[PDB]
Copies of this chain bind each other. A is one copy, B any other.
Amino acid sequence: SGFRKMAFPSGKVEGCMVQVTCGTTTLNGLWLDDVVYCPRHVICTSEDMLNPNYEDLLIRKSNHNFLVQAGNVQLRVIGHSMQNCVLKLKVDTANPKTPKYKFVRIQPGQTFSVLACYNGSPSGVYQCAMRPNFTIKGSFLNGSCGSVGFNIDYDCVSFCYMHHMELPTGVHAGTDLEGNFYGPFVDRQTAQAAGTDTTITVNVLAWLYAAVINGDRWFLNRFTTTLNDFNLVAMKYNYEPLTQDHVDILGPLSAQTGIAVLDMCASLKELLQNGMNGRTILGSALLEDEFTPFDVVRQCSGVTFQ
């Protein structure tokens, strides 16, 4: 038993990480089949960042201005193109370690694993969620750009995030693997509003179920509530409105613990109106919202991969 915030094993992704250099800028790229993916702002100088014309900037570059290094090995670039905010470098060598992969665009509230990378070498791995305002709260230093987020379905790697830039909040923004930003962000060094972040109500309920499943049950009360009543408390409190779909996705945890979702909503309501009283749930003094219901199900089912 026990419950930890847990990332997918990153082996399948480590084999895809390469170093990409263009001029005096180095960052990470994703090497799959015979294509290298990376943020297009690798083509920018530190002055270009304030207002780049990427088309014009890309025109001044040729294949040989792009150094791709996979470990020690130099790949030869033979085609380059710009898809949205990513740059796709065609190389002469397919990656012998290409996993079975997909590119997905995830939804706010879903979770994924980040492998943070510098100079093409993996640094660490951690788990997180696409916030409702389409930011992620991660850990990214200079040179982490091009690090990717992913989920694993048995053998198949679903890539969903590529890191591009930190906002003035210490929150991070980026794109899917077709180069479209999550959220309204553009890749330019100009002030940008992240927007009001809300809490992922369904994820919090799934966590409370993970708590019950792991012995923590003090928050459990004699009350119930209605979907509309609870939603009315959800909104004084920043919470995502709870829908019937949310209720259904919480259904399996419902039946395992024998606790109705709306009874659980009542306990959450009391927590939101009465706080923690200096107590903890699964060793946190806060309400945690970065476990999807599926993260909960599989953590106490033992789903494996590879």
Interface residues of A (CB under 8 A from B): 1-11, 14-15, 71, 115-119, 121-126, 128, 137-144, 166, 170-172, 214-215, 275-276, 278, 280, 283-286, 299-306
Q: Is the CB of A284 within 8 A of B283?
A: no
A interface majority secondary structure? loop
A124 contact set on B, CB distance < 8 A: 6-9, 299
Q: Is the CB of B304 within 8 A of A1?
A: no
Q: Is the CB of B8 within 8 A of A125?
A: yes
Measured CA separation A305–B120 after assembly (Å) = 10
Per assembly, the copies of the chain total 2
A14 contact set on B, CB distance < 8 A: 9, 11, 306
The residue from B5, B9, B171, B286 contacting A5, defined by CB atoms under 8 A apart: B5
A140 contact set on B, CB distance < 8 A: 1-2
Once A121-B304, A123-B302, A306-B121 are accepted as A-B contacts, the answer to whether A138 and B4 lie under 8 Å apart by CB is yes
CB distance from A191 to the nearest CB of B (A): 17
Q: Is the CB of A4 within 8 A of B215?
A: no
A172 contact set on B, CB distance < 8 A: 2
Once A122-B9, A302-B123, A305-B123 are accepted as A-B contacts, the answer to whether A139 and B170 lie under 8 Å apart by CB is no
Once A1-B141, A304-B121 are accepted as A-B contacts, the answer to whether A9 and B10 lie under 8 Å apart by CB is yes
Measured CA separation A140–B215 after assembly (Å) = 15
Closest B residue to A124 by beta carbon equals B6
Q: Is the CB of B306 within 8 A of A122?
A: yes
- Considering the complex of A and B, which 10 residue pairs feature the smallest CB-CB distances, nearest first? A285-B285, A11-B11, A121-B304, A6-B124, A9-B122, A11-B14, A4-B139, A2-B139, A4-B126, A6-B126
Q: Is the CB of B11 within 8 A of A170?
A: no
